Amino acid sequence: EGIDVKKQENFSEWYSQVITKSEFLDYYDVSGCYIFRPNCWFVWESVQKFFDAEIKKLGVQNVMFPLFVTKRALETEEGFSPEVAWVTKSGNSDLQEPIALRPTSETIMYPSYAKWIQSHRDLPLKLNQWTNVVRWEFKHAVPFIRSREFYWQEGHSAFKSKEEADEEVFTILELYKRVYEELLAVPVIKGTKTENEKFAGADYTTTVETFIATNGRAVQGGTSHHLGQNFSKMFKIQFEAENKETQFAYQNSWGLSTRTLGVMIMVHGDDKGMVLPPRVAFCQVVVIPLINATLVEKTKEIYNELEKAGIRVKLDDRLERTPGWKYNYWELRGVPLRIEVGPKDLEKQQIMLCRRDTGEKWTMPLSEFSGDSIKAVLDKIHDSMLNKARKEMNERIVVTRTWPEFIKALNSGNMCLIPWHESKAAEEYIKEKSKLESVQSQSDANTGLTGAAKSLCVPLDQSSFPSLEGLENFYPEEAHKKPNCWALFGRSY
Amino acid sequence: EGIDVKKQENFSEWYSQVITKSEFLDYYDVSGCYIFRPNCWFVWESVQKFFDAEIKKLGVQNVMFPLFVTKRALETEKGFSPEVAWVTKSGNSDLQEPIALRPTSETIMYPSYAKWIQSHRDLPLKLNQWTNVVRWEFKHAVPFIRSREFYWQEGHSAFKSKEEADEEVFTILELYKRVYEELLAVPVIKGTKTENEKFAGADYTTTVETFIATNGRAVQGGTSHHLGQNFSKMFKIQFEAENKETQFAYQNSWGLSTRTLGVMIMVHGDDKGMVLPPRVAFCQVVVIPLINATLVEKTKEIYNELEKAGIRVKLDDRLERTPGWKYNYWELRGVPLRIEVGPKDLEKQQIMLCRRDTGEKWTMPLSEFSGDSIKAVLDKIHDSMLNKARKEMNERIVVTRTWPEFIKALNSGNMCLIPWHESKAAEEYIKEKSKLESVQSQSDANTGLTGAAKSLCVPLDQSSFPSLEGLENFYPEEAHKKPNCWALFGRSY
Ligand SMILES: Nc1ncnc2c1ncn2[C@@H]1O[C@H](COP(=O)(O)OP(=O)(O)NP(=O)(O)O)[C@@H](O)[C@H]1O
Ligand SMILES: Nc1ncnc2c1ncn2[C@@H]1O[C@H](COP(=O)(O)OP(=O)(O)NP(=O)(O)O)[C@@H](O)[C@H]1O
Ligand SMILES: O=C(C[C@H]1NCCC[C@@H]1O)Cn1cnc2cc(Br)c(Cl)cc2c1=O
Ligand SMILES: O=C(C[C@H]1NCCC[C@@H]1O)Cn1cnc2cc(Br)c(Cl)cc2c1=O
Ligand SMILES: [Mg+2]
Ligand SMILES: [Mg+2]
């Protein structure tokens, strides 16, 4: 019926109410696993359709490798071993050989890559799969953001040269930016991860960072690695080059998950419920006749013209429901645009429009109604949602040249740009010190989160940042390691 | 290389060579699990695209429920226990209780159906999901046909009346017939399973049966159940009806798996390799210029015409390879149509065509060449493939009124239409009597198959069948129970 807790009052309770009452998600009796209902799964299918079409242009092909992986394969690569789920029984009998569930597919796929790649004519090899993933997360589960079963695509490419591989890393990273910005209306920051946060198997890791303004937390939104020759040496992925010598392939891997849906909801949801970006909305426009014979047919005509134009449109002519009840029903579920067709408005040859993101109501003359004009309204809603979130995000990025500035901005829910010289020890120092001086909400503490700051990324584009002249390393033991770039640090999920 | 064992010489070795050398499938180090390579996964994606579009017209919506099910939930349904795969630990730590991997999702989904359905206004509820499934099969694994991990869609619907549910069962069954015939060029027989073979939770089970002529075996191709109120009583799926009574919902479920791909290959594959039905072929047409600047330009124009028409076309202009080498390359991989462009052909303003299913070669004048005319050729190939398979299947259905006729037809690789009076004891009698008198190939024996006759289905359409007057029950202990329909029996996978 309604959200009874405000987003600003208790973020975790608000989130639970919005994802369930919108019919997006239900809870389940295996901890950390969730049910994706139709309006929710539609968003992920929309991401799939867009991403598939974009990677097809790059020559990537979809495959399906198995869910199961042997201990022998997995151990070809300690740190992650507590998160692996093990199948050990069939029926009532122990298996002679326990097997694990897919936590990622490097060790499942790369023995095949070593078989399939024999010469440079076999390269590039670029494969993708849309799969479920299992990780027995130690951290508290969070619907969409951190689930023990989640859904993703993982792409794995092999190249004859580093230049080709480098180019794909940033091409895929741009596609992840386009998913967030063009489909989900969520702004991103591109950067590289620090040595402590990057994939241990990667030469370097790139990320799109996203930001949750309500509790001032970043979310790692998607990942694109250059693996160098680290895995090709591990798995003997070699080829005869055109120069007749044998070389190790250069590889990348990259993944994007249903975490996207959680970011979308946390960024755009409000105290009336879901707010769906038009390009992933299960229903983009709901038409509601206010209740007469002629009004019904014009309402049917409005429905049919939008449907013919490819707009996902619904006609809510339910009899036993008041107009206001219908308004709440579809606002709760996130429909971006409502058309109200009333008798008074029909007399003036017009209709009433209400946009979900701002609540604004305005009239449109029927002479200006069309599939194109309604699509233009939907694009305006998309642009406003993205622009509002980007303005909020940018206002919450603070340049913090010194520790007192850093901890102050962190405690007020900002992301911080700090002078940086790469060092695992410096990053650990910052994490421990900020954690000791941090404060966080009871809701965040209940969600298993910490007030500690961690590295989010080193932004790719440093051109707008101020001078590093005279700035000191945040880690006093490494004052002799002069800062030479800016890093983004903040609280995180 | 190429296929070096004939389909009629050693069926299981032929099958292994065709699925691997065509780049459809690779073997893997977990028993009963296989790698689906791009050209193979394309077939399943094509089935998904078609089936999704058709069930959308019915109001069915896609969802995703979890991979895991609790022990308590799994035992609510009231045999299969040895096939259940159990996760018992994460890393080194035992779980509090083991959790099972999805063998099917009745016990995962129906507790939610009971929560979600409360009024007749909540019905019908029609959900579908495209998922992986795990069953610890005791029978010998067979690529595609019987794998320990497999992929399917499962649909689960709830209705306020039996009439609505009945209609859906046969609507879905017709869609499965269309998948096999219109996409895969595989003929089917629709029928109802006997009491011994139907799903224990179902009031009745329908099936599309398919036939592998090489070893005279049926394959159950897809399943559509009417569950009645059996599960809604089990899970308390109830609704307030229009008359204010509380009533149990009527339910169906239905599933179709990647077994489809195995049937397609076993039916159409030949001694040169894969033979792809055009509507699921990763590449429908390969254009090969015979080597010259004019020929190169005309060949590119031929390619461009087909690409613009939406035909999946490749241009194989590889330089140092004989025509016959390229021909073998694409024949092995199953491409249904080859276009050869040589200077002598262009001097007669014609191109040379060669169809994969029959090997026929013929010329087409350039003035008759277009996207539409090539599509018509591809449709002709589809029709021929389906018609050939149907003719063979019908020739291998034998009306067997007496036991000597039955065992003769069975041992010669036919399906048998027998006078039938439903009885589990009669079905078991026929199974054990036929097993004792049966013969089968060494390849079938090595595949873990048997010569026993299984009930396949009672065909829905009995109108073309002979008179039952004066026919005798095959089971002498029930001689007083006169045959009242015809049943299809045969060897099976
Ligand atoms: N448990 C999870 N649930 C949902 N999405 C996830 C989960 N773990 C990771 N992802 C997402 O999947 C992407 C690729 O996964 P990966 O690089 O393995 O993540 P990661 O290093 O484990 N990150 P994290 O655990 O969030 O600190 C990440 O960038 C996340 O956006
Ligand atoms: N192990 C398997 N591998 C691939 N497809 C399968 C497998 N088991 C069943 N299927 C297919 O999935 C459909 C729905 O499954 P279901 O009704 O549960 O099969 P079933 O009763 O176990 N049949 P079967 O084991 O072949 O005798 C079946 O009609 C088959 O076409
Ligand atoms: O999963 C990765 C690296 C990349 N794989 C391809 C898709 C994108 C992704 O960033 C990092 N990672 C994360 N969590 C893991 C958990 C376990 Br359990 C294991 Cl064994 C391994 C891993 C592991 O490798
Ligand atoms: O899986 C079924 C019934 C139907 N489920 C929905 C899709 C279509 C399908 O025919 C039958 N079946 C088959 N094999 C099973 C194996 C195990 Br293990 C379990 Cl627990 C249960 C089952 C089980 O229920
Ligand atoms: Mg992780
Ligand atoms: Mg079975």
Side-chain angles (χ1 to χ4, degrees), chain A residues 26 28 35-36 45 62 64 67-68 70 81 84 86 88-91 115-116 136 149 151, chain B residues 26 28-29 35-36 45 62 64 67-68 70 81 84 86 88-91 112 116 132 149 151:
Chain A
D26 229 334
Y28 190 61
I35 297 160
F36 293 57
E45 290 183 331
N62 288 349
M64 187 58 55
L67 169 69
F68 296 123
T70 59
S81 70
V84 184
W86 288 95
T88 76
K89 301 188 71 161
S90 67
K115 174 200 172 188
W116 295 335
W136 230 247
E149 182 182 14
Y151 309 94
Chain B
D26 258 342
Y28 186 63
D29 73 337
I35 295 160
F36 292 54
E45 293 181 323
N62 286 350
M64 186 60 54
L67 170 69
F68 298 116
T70 63
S81 122
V84 176
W86 293 97
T88 68
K89 66 179 179 178
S90 59
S112 292
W116 292 339
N132 51 353
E149 184 186 10
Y151 308 92

Short mmCIF file of all heavy atoms in Angstrom, two decimals, chain A residues 26 28 35-36 45 62 64 67-68 70 81 84 86 88-91 115-116 136 149 151, chain B residues 26 28-29 35-36 45 62 64 67-68 70 81 84 86 88-91 112 116 132 149 151:
data_model
loop_
_atom_site.label_atom_id
_atom_site.label_comp_id
_atom_site.label_asym_id
_atom_site.label_seq_id
_atom_site.Cartn_x
_atom_site.Cartn_y
_atom_site.Cartn_z
N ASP A 26 11.45 -10.59 -3.38
CA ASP A 26 11.00 -11.19 -2.14
C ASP A 26 12.17 -11.87 -1.44
O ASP A 26 13.15 -12.26 -2.07
CB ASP A 26 9.87 -12.19 -2.34
CG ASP A 26 8.72 -11.93 -1.39
OD1 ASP A 26 8.97 -11.36 -0.30
OD2 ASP A 26 7.58 -12.28 -1.73
N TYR A 28 13.77 -14.96 1.06
CA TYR A 28 13.82 -16.40 0.86
C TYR A 28 14.41 -17.05 2.11
O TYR A 28 15.01 -16.38 2.95
CB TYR A 28 14.64 -16.71 -0.40
CG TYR A 28 14.61 -18.12 -0.90
CD1 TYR A 28 13.42 -18.73 -1.30
CD2 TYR A 28 15.79 -18.85 -1.01
CE1 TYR A 28 13.41 -20.03 -1.79
CE2 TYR A 28 15.79 -20.14 -1.50
CZ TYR A 28 14.60 -20.73 -1.88
OH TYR A 28 14.63 -22.02 -2.35
N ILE A 35 14.48 -13.55 -4.37
CA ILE A 35 13.61 -13.86 -5.50
C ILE A 35 13.44 -12.60 -6.35
O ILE A 35 13.04 -11.55 -5.84
CB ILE A 35 12.24 -14.35 -4.99
CG1 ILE A 35 12.40 -15.65 -4.21
CG2 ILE A 35 11.24 -14.47 -6.17
CD1 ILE A 35 11.24 -15.95 -3.29
N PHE A 36 13.75 -12.71 -7.65
CA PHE A 36 13.62 -11.59 -8.60
C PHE A 36 12.27 -11.73 -9.29
O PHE A 36 12.09 -12.62 -10.13
CB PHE A 36 14.74 -11.58 -9.64
CG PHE A 36 16.12 -11.30 -9.10
CD1 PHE A 36 16.68 -12.08 -8.11
CD2 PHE A 36 16.88 -10.28 -9.65
CE1 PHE A 36 17.96 -11.82 -7.63
CE2 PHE A 36 18.18 -10.03 -9.18
CZ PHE A 36 18.70 -10.79 -8.17
N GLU A 45 17.01 -8.18 -17.78
CA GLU A 45 16.89 -8.55 -19.18
C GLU A 45 17.18 -7.37 -20.11
O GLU A 45 17.73 -7.56 -21.20
CB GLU A 45 15.49 -9.11 -19.47
CG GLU A 45 15.24 -10.45 -18.83
CD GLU A 45 13.87 -10.99 -19.20
OE1 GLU A 45 12.95 -10.18 -19.43
OE2 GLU A 45 13.72 -12.22 -19.25
N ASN A 62 28.62 -15.31 -27.17
CA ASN A 62 28.12 -15.89 -25.93
C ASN A 62 28.33 -17.40 -25.91
O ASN A 62 28.21 -18.08 -26.93
CB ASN A 62 26.63 -15.59 -25.73
CG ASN A 62 26.38 -14.14 -25.39
OD1 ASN A 62 27.31 -13.39 -25.09
ND2 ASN A 62 25.10 -13.75 -25.41
N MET A 64 28.30 -21.01 -22.80
CA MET A 64 27.92 -21.41 -21.45
C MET A 64 28.86 -22.51 -20.97
O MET A 64 28.82 -23.63 -21.49
CB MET A 64 26.47 -21.88 -21.37
CG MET A 64 26.03 -22.13 -19.91
SD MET A 64 26.19 -20.64 -18.88
CE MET A 64 25.23 -19.47 -19.82
N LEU A 67 28.58 -24.94 -14.19
CA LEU A 67 28.46 -24.42 -12.83
C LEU A 67 29.49 -25.03 -11.89
O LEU A 67 29.89 -24.40 -10.91
CB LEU A 67 27.04 -24.74 -12.30
CG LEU A 67 26.75 -24.51 -10.81
CD1 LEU A 67 26.74 -23.03 -10.46
CD2 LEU A 67 25.42 -25.17 -10.43
N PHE A 68 29.90 -26.26 -12.16
CA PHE A 68 30.78 -26.99 -11.26
C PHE A 68 32.22 -26.81 -11.66
O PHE A 68 32.55 -26.74 -12.85
CB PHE A 68 30.44 -28.48 -11.26
CG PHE A 68 29.08 -28.79 -10.73
CD1 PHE A 68 28.16 -29.48 -11.50
CD2 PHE A 68 28.71 -28.39 -9.45
CE1 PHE A 68 26.90 -29.77 -11.02
CE2 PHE A 68 27.45 -28.67 -8.95
CZ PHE A 68 26.54 -29.37 -9.74
N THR A 70 36.27 -28.33 -10.41
CA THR A 70 37.01 -29.24 -9.54
C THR A 70 37.92 -28.48 -8.58
O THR A 70 38.31 -27.33 -8.82
CB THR A 70 37.86 -30.24 -10.34
OG1 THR A 70 38.80 -29.55 -11.16
CG2 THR A 70 36.97 -31.16 -11.20
N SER A 81 39.27 -18.95 -0.30
CA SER A 81 38.81 -20.30 -0.03
C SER A 81 37.64 -20.38 0.95
O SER A 81 36.78 -21.25 0.76
CB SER A 81 39.99 -21.17 0.44
OG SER A 81 40.44 -20.82 1.74
N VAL A 84 34.07 -20.37 -0.91
CA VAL A 84 33.70 -21.39 -1.90
C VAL A 84 32.64 -22.31 -1.32
O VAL A 84 32.82 -22.86 -0.23
CB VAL A 84 34.94 -22.20 -2.33
CG1 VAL A 84 34.55 -23.17 -3.41
CG2 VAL A 84 36.09 -21.29 -2.78
N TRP A 86 30.77 -25.91 -1.47
CA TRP A 86 31.17 -27.25 -1.89
C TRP A 86 30.00 -28.21 -1.91
O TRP A 86 29.30 -28.37 -0.90
CB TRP A 86 32.25 -27.80 -0.96
CG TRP A 86 33.56 -27.12 -1.16
CD1 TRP A 86 34.05 -26.07 -0.45
CD2 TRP A 86 34.53 -27.43 -2.16
NE1 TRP A 86 35.28 -25.71 -0.94
CE2 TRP A 86 35.60 -26.52 -1.99
CE3 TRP A 86 34.61 -28.39 -3.17
CZ2 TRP A 86 36.74 -26.55 -2.80
CZ3 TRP A 86 35.74 -28.41 -3.98
CH2 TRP A 86 36.79 -27.49 -3.78
N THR A 88 29.09 -31.92 -1.62
CA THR A 88 29.78 -33.08 -1.06
C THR A 88 28.92 -34.32 -0.96
O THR A 88 29.42 -35.36 -0.53
CB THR A 88 30.33 -32.76 0.34
OG1 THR A 88 29.25 -32.77 1.28
CG2 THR A 88 31.01 -31.40 0.36
N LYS A 89 27.64 -34.26 -1.32
CA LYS A 89 26.77 -35.41 -1.18
C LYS A 89 25.79 -35.45 -2.34
O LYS A 89 25.40 -34.42 -2.88
CB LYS A 89 25.98 -35.39 0.15
CG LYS A 89 26.83 -35.37 1.41
CD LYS A 89 25.99 -35.54 2.67
CE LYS A 89 25.45 -36.95 2.79
NZ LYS A 89 25.02 -37.26 4.18
N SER A 90 25.41 -36.67 -2.72
CA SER A 90 24.28 -36.90 -3.60
C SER A 90 23.34 -37.85 -2.86
O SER A 90 23.79 -38.87 -2.33
CB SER A 90 24.71 -37.50 -4.94
OG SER A 90 25.22 -38.81 -4.77
N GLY A 91 22.06 -37.48 -2.79
CA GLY A 91 21.15 -38.26 -1.97
C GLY A 91 21.63 -38.28 -0.53
O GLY A 91 21.90 -37.23 0.06
N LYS A 115 43.58 -24.99 -25.06
CA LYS A 115 43.35 -25.96 -26.13
C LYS A 115 43.00 -25.26 -27.43
O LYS A 115 43.49 -25.65 -28.50
CB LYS A 115 42.22 -26.91 -25.72
CG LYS A 115 41.81 -27.86 -26.83
CD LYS A 115 40.42 -28.43 -26.58
CE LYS A 115 39.94 -29.21 -27.80
NZ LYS A 115 38.53 -29.63 -27.67
N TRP A 116 42.13 -24.25 -27.37
CA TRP A 116 41.58 -23.63 -28.57
C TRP A 116 42.55 -22.69 -29.26
O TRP A 116 42.45 -22.49 -30.48
CB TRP A 116 40.30 -22.87 -28.22
CG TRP A 116 39.19 -23.75 -27.76
CD1 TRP A 116 39.02 -25.06 -28.05
CD2 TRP A 116 38.09 -23.37 -26.92
NE1 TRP A 116 37.88 -25.54 -27.44
CE2 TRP A 116 37.29 -24.52 -26.74
CE3 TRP A 116 37.71 -22.18 -26.29
CZ2 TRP A 116 36.13 -24.51 -25.98
CZ3 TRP A 116 36.55 -22.17 -25.54
CH2 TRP A 116 35.78 -23.33 -25.38
N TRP A 136 30.05 -17.59 -0.76
CA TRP A 136 29.58 -17.59 0.62
C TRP A 136 30.15 -16.35 1.33
O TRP A 136 31.08 -16.42 2.13
CB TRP A 136 29.94 -18.88 1.32
CG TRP A 136 28.75 -19.46 2.00
CD1 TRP A 136 28.56 -19.59 3.35
CD2 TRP A 136 27.54 -19.91 1.38
NE1 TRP A 136 27.32 -20.13 3.60
CE2 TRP A 136 26.68 -20.33 2.40
CE3 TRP A 136 27.12 -20.01 0.05
CZ2 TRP A 136 25.41 -20.86 2.14
CZ3 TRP A 136 25.86 -20.52 -0.21
CH2 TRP A 136 25.02 -20.94 0.83
N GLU A 149 23.99 -15.84 -3.90
CA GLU A 149 23.85 -16.12 -5.32
C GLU A 149 23.55 -14.80 -6.00
O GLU A 149 22.70 -14.04 -5.53
CB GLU A 149 22.71 -17.12 -5.61
CG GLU A 149 22.62 -17.43 -7.11
CD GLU A 149 21.47 -18.38 -7.47
OE1 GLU A 149 20.58 -18.61 -6.64
OE2 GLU A 149 21.49 -18.90 -8.61
N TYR A 151 23.68 -12.78 -10.21
CA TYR A 151 23.68 -13.00 -11.65
C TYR A 151 24.58 -11.95 -12.28
O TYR A 151 24.61 -10.80 -11.84
CB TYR A 151 22.24 -12.93 -12.21
CG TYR A 151 21.35 -13.83 -11.41
CD1 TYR A 151 20.61 -13.35 -10.32
CD2 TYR A 151 21.31 -15.19 -11.67
CE1 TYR A 151 19.81 -14.21 -9.55
CE2 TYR A 151 20.53 -16.05 -10.91
CZ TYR A 151 19.79 -15.56 -9.84
OH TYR A 151 19.01 -16.43 -9.10
N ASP B 26 32.42 -29.16 -25.91
CA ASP B 26 33.66 -29.76 -25.43
C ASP B 26 33.40 -30.51 -24.13
O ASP B 26 32.48 -30.18 -23.38
CB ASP B 26 34.77 -28.71 -25.22
CG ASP B 26 35.79 -28.70 -26.35
OD1 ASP B 26 35.85 -29.69 -27.11
OD2 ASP B 26 36.53 -27.71 -26.48
N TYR B 28 34.60 -32.01 -20.31
CA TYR B 28 34.93 -31.24 -19.12
C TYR B 28 35.28 -32.21 -18.00
O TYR B 28 34.93 -33.39 -18.07
CB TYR B 28 33.73 -30.35 -18.74
CG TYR B 28 33.96 -29.38 -17.61
CD1 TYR B 28 34.90 -28.36 -17.73
CD2 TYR B 28 33.22 -29.45 -16.43
CE1 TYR B 28 35.11 -27.46 -16.70
CE2 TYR B 28 33.42 -28.55 -15.39
CZ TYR B 28 34.37 -27.56 -15.53
OH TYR B 28 34.58 -26.67 -14.50
N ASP B 29 35.96 -31.72 -16.96
CA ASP B 29 36.49 -32.62 -15.93
C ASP B 29 35.54 -32.81 -14.73
O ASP B 29 35.96 -33.29 -13.68
CB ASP B 29 37.88 -32.16 -15.46
CG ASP B 29 37.85 -30.89 -14.59
OD1 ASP B 29 36.87 -30.11 -14.68
OD2 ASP B 29 38.83 -30.67 -13.84
N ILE B 35 30.71 -28.25 -22.08
CA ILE B 35 30.93 -26.85 -22.43
C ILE B 35 30.15 -26.56 -23.71
O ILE B 35 30.34 -27.25 -24.72
CB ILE B 35 32.42 -26.57 -22.63
CG1 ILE B 35 33.19 -26.75 -21.32
CG2 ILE B 35 32.61 -25.16 -23.24
CD1 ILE B 35 34.70 -26.97 -21.49
N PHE B 36 29.27 -25.56 -23.67
CA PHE B 36 28.48 -25.16 -24.85
C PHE B 36 29.22 -24.02 -25.54
O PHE B 36 29.27 -22.90 -25.02
CB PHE B 36 27.07 -24.69 -24.46
CG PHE B 36 26.16 -25.77 -23.92
CD1 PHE B 36 26.55 -26.57 -22.86
CD2 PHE B 36 24.89 -25.94 -24.45
CE1 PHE B 36 25.70 -27.56 -22.36
CE2 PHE B 36 24.03 -26.92 -23.95
CZ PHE B 36 24.44 -27.73 -22.91
N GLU B 45 19.90 -19.99 -27.52
CA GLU B 45 19.44 -18.60 -27.53
C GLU B 45 18.32 -18.40 -28.55
O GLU B 45 17.42 -17.58 -28.33
CB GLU B 45 20.60 -17.64 -27.84
CG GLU B 45 21.67 -17.59 -26.73
CD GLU B 45 22.78 -16.60 -27.08
OE1 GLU B 45 23.15 -16.51 -28.27
OE2 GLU B 45 23.28 -15.94 -26.17
N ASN B 62 8.73 -13.54 -17.17
CA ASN B 62 9.98 -14.16 -16.73
C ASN B 62 10.39 -13.67 -15.34
O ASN B 62 10.22 -12.50 -15.01
CB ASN B 62 11.12 -13.86 -17.72
CG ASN B 62 10.99 -14.67 -19.01
OD1 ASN B 62 10.17 -15.58 -19.10
ND2 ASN B 62 11.81 -14.33 -20.01
N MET B 64 13.31 -14.92 -11.81
CA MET B 64 14.42 -15.80 -11.44
C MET B 64 14.33 -16.11 -9.95
O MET B 64 14.47 -15.20 -9.13
CB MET B 64 15.77 -15.17 -11.76
CG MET B 64 16.92 -16.12 -11.52
SD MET B 64 16.81 -17.63 -12.51
CE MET B 64 16.64 -16.95 -14.15
N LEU B 67 18.85 -20.78 -6.89
CA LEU B 67 19.44 -22.09 -7.15
C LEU B 67 19.28 -23.05 -5.98
O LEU B 67 19.24 -24.27 -6.17
CB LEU B 67 20.94 -21.89 -7.45
CG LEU B 67 21.80 -23.15 -7.52
CD1 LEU B 67 21.42 -23.95 -8.77
CD2 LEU B 67 23.27 -22.76 -7.54
N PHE B 68 19.21 -22.53 -4.76
CA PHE B 68 19.23 -23.35 -3.56
C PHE B 68 17.84 -23.61 -3.02
O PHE B 68 16.96 -22.75 -3.07
CB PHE B 68 20.05 -22.68 -2.46
CG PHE B 68 21.49 -22.48 -2.82
CD1 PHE B 68 22.02 -21.20 -2.93
CD2 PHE B 68 22.30 -23.57 -3.05
CE1 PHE B 68 23.35 -21.02 -3.26
CE2 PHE B 68 23.63 -23.39 -3.38
CZ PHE B 68 24.15 -22.12 -3.48
N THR B 70 16.03 -25.50 0.65
CA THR B 70 16.29 -26.12 1.94
C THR B 70 15.77 -27.56 1.95
O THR B 70 14.90 -27.95 1.18
CB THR B 70 15.64 -25.33 3.08
OG1 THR B 70 14.22 -25.33 2.93
CG2 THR B 70 16.13 -23.88 3.09
N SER B 81 15.20 -38.86 -4.28
CA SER B 81 16.22 -38.48 -3.31
C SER B 81 17.66 -38.76 -3.75
O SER B 81 18.52 -37.89 -3.52
CB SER B 81 15.92 -39.16 -1.96
OG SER B 81 17.00 -39.97 -1.53
N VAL B 84 19.47 -35.87 -5.80
CA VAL B 84 19.61 -34.53 -5.22
C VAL B 84 21.07 -34.27 -4.88
O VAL B 84 21.69 -35.04 -4.13
CB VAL B 84 18.74 -34.40 -3.96
CG1 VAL B 84 18.97 -33.04 -3.30
CG2 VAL B 84 17.27 -34.61 -4.27
N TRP B 86 23.74 -32.02 -2.84
CA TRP B 86 23.71 -31.28 -1.58
C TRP B 86 24.99 -30.47 -1.40
O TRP B 86 26.10 -31.00 -1.52
CB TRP B 86 23.54 -32.23 -0.39
CG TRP B 86 22.20 -32.88 -0.37
CD1 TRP B 86 21.88 -34.12 -0.84
CD2 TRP B 86 20.99 -32.32 0.16
NE1 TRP B 86 20.54 -34.37 -0.65
CE2 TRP B 86 19.97 -33.28 -0.03
CE3 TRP B 86 20.67 -31.11 0.78
CZ2 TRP B 86 18.66 -33.06 0.37
CZ3 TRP B 86 19.36 -30.90 1.18
CH2 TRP B 86 18.37 -31.86 0.97
N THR B 88 27.10 -28.81 1.45
CA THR B 88 27.20 -29.02 2.88
C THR B 88 28.16 -28.06 3.58
O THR B 88 28.17 -28.02 4.81
CB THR B 88 27.63 -30.46 3.19
OG1 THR B 88 28.97 -30.67 2.75
CG2 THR B 88 26.69 -31.45 2.49
N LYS B 89 28.97 -27.31 2.84
CA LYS B 89 29.98 -26.52 3.53
C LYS B 89 30.45 -25.37 2.65
O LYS B 89 30.34 -25.41 1.42
CB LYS B 89 31.18 -27.37 3.97
CG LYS B 89 31.99 -27.94 2.83
CD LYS B 89 33.19 -28.76 3.31
CE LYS B 89 33.96 -29.33 2.12
NZ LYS B 89 35.17 -30.12 2.53
N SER B 90 30.95 -24.34 3.32
CA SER B 90 31.63 -23.21 2.69
C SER B 90 33.06 -23.23 3.19
O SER B 90 33.28 -23.21 4.41
CB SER B 90 30.95 -21.89 3.05
OG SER B 90 30.96 -21.72 4.46
N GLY B 91 34.01 -23.25 2.27
CA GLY B 91 35.40 -23.47 2.66
C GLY B 91 35.51 -24.75 3.47
O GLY B 91 35.13 -25.83 3.00
N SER B 112 6.08 -19.13 -2.31
CA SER B 112 5.82 -17.75 -2.72
C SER B 112 4.45 -17.60 -3.37
O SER B 112 3.76 -16.60 -3.16
CB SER B 112 6.91 -17.28 -3.69
OG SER B 112 8.16 -17.15 -3.02
N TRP B 116 1.71 -14.88 -2.45
CA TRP B 116 1.33 -13.87 -3.43
C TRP B 116 -0.13 -13.95 -3.84
O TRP B 116 -0.71 -12.94 -4.24
CB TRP B 116 2.19 -14.00 -4.69
CG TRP B 116 3.63 -13.66 -4.47
CD1 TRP B 116 4.16 -12.91 -3.47
CD2 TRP B 116 4.73 -14.09 -5.28
NE1 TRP B 116 5.53 -12.83 -3.61
CE2 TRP B 116 5.90 -13.55 -4.72
CE3 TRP B 116 4.84 -14.88 -6.43
CZ2 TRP B 116 7.16 -13.77 -5.26
CZ3 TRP B 116 6.08 -15.11 -6.97
CH2 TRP B 116 7.23 -14.55 -6.38
N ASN B 132 19.57 -23.02 -15.03
CA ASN B 132 20.28 -24.29 -14.99
C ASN B 132 19.67 -25.17 -13.92
O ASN B 132 19.08 -24.70 -12.96
CB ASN B 132 21.79 -24.11 -14.76
CG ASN B 132 22.15 -23.21 -13.57
OD1 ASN B 132 21.31 -22.60 -12.94
ND2 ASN B 132 23.44 -23.14 -13.27
N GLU B 149 24.31 -31.29 -15.23
CA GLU B 149 23.80 -29.92 -15.29
C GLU B 149 23.17 -29.76 -16.66
O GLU B 149 23.79 -30.13 -17.67
CB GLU B 149 24.90 -28.87 -15.09
CG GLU B 149 24.30 -27.46 -15.06
CD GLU B 149 25.34 -26.35 -15.01
OE1 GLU B 149 26.55 -26.63 -15.19
OE2 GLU B 149 24.94 -25.19 -14.78
N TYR B 151 20.18 -27.05 -19.02
CA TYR B 151 19.52 -25.75 -19.08
C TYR B 151 18.11 -25.94 -19.62
O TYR B 151 17.89 -26.75 -20.53
CB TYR B 151 20.31 -24.79 -19.96
CG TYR B 151 21.76 -24.75 -19.50
CD1 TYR B 151 22.71 -25.59 -20.05
CD2 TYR B 151 22.15 -23.92 -18.46
CE1 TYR B 151 24.03 -25.59 -19.60
CE2 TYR B 151 23.47 -23.89 -18.01
CZ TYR B 151 24.40 -24.75 -18.58
OH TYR B 151 25.72 -24.75 -18.16
#
